[model samples]
Target: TPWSKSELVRQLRDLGVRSGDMVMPHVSLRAVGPLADGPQTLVDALIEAVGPTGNILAFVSWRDSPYEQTLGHDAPPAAIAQSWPAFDPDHAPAYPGFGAINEFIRTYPGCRRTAHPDASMAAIGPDAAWLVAPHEMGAAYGPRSPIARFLAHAGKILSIGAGPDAVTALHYAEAVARIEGKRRVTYSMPLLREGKRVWVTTSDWDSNGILDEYAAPDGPDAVERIARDYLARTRVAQGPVGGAQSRLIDAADIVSFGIEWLEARHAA
Candidate 1:
């Protein structure tokens, strides 16, 4: 079934998405079925649903950035290294692995994106600038990171046919979780500093594998487990948006529960 922008607005509103509420949407167009104008229609509907007072935030990591293993230290020799472009928050496309909506929103004329190389975020609406402000270079998902700003503004997790694994705010919980000796992943990227291109190396919490205890070799593993556990423990507003099932979940509750969930499992 094809979905219209207005109808999507209605469905989103019916799910408790209202004006002045910040939203971190993880939408999968494939699951939502085809729309009249494709993702643009969904973006329009989201904007209308939240209106001018609210904001939409997306985790927009940089595409084709470097990732190296600290254990083995594998990398191309510095002699043959190729040049990498500096992060241009105003223009670089969002990582497609996150979803198509992310790239679409990041490219919108009104959207603003943070320059956090490991954990860039994009947003639109009144508070977009603050929501996507620079995060702690060492703590990509720390207490003051872009994801935390979502909670500061009382944002909601808009899961439109996206899985529990797509819930990004949970990473903030990992940053705050009571885990000793948390691993960090280091990477380097070209960044503009004082009008000059500089290669900046940053080490951030290894969001990919936060804990060795729960590091399942493959699959969503911890992300999915923690999210599903939270759902089982709390009441989340859920319904259908087009052909896809969706939810309007409280961001604060997510982080709060995420902390408890991770600690409990960590202790066990």
Candidate 2:
């Protein structure tokens, strides 16, 4: 039988989520088996579990940004210039690869999303404005980003049927630790400025290739290992959400531990 929203809510409760807790969740709906009402049910369940006072956040990357068009061999500067449309935060779709859960939330009524063209995020509830307010072009996942706000508010990270690799808090750790060889790249995206579409250029950390040097044990794998170890030592909370494994973790603790872990690994 497909898991119902109420059942998922019960599972979340069992995993230590409670009313008034601010949560940022990364979910893989397919891994959760079947949902009776699709992605919206899961979204509703999360909102219900946390209640009105609670906030729910999801990363809503703009996958179709013109920045991607500049990367391919077939992509000509003229072609990109002619085809790319200014990003309309009010209507742009969530990056396709981020999954339907994020898309549903991004389009949900009363949800607010940040203005960053490439790495925007969406949030709902009282803290929504606080979470999405500071995201800017160069501050993708840095101190002024939503992840930082989440940590400052003592928020929780909820992973539903997703691995530790999907834990974005690790990015916060990277920014804090300033791991050597961390690279940044410049890209352009169209944004609405002064009532006209303008091409804007900005730089962001190269999140993908940060682990290249550590061949035997790459960055993400190392972070995942550390997260599991921390979860074991702290016994934060973990259980089955439908057919998929789910985990709930303290935002501050994980990032703190991740920073120390990265520093030690780099020092060695």
Q: Choose the strongest candidate by TM-score.
A: 1
- Candidate 2, residues 109-227, lDDT tens digits: the string is 99998988788889999989988997887788888998889899989999988877778777777767746766566777778886788776767665554455533343545556667
- Candidate 2 residues lying further than 4 Å off, grouped into runs, are 71-76, 214-234
TM-score of each: 0.92, 0.89
Worst 10 residues of 2 by lDDT: 209-218
Superposed Cα deviation of residue 63, candidate 1 (Å): 1.7
Which parts of model 1 have CA positions greater than 4 angstroms off?
68-81
Worst 10 residues of 1 by lDDT: 68-77
Best-matching candidate per lDDT? 2
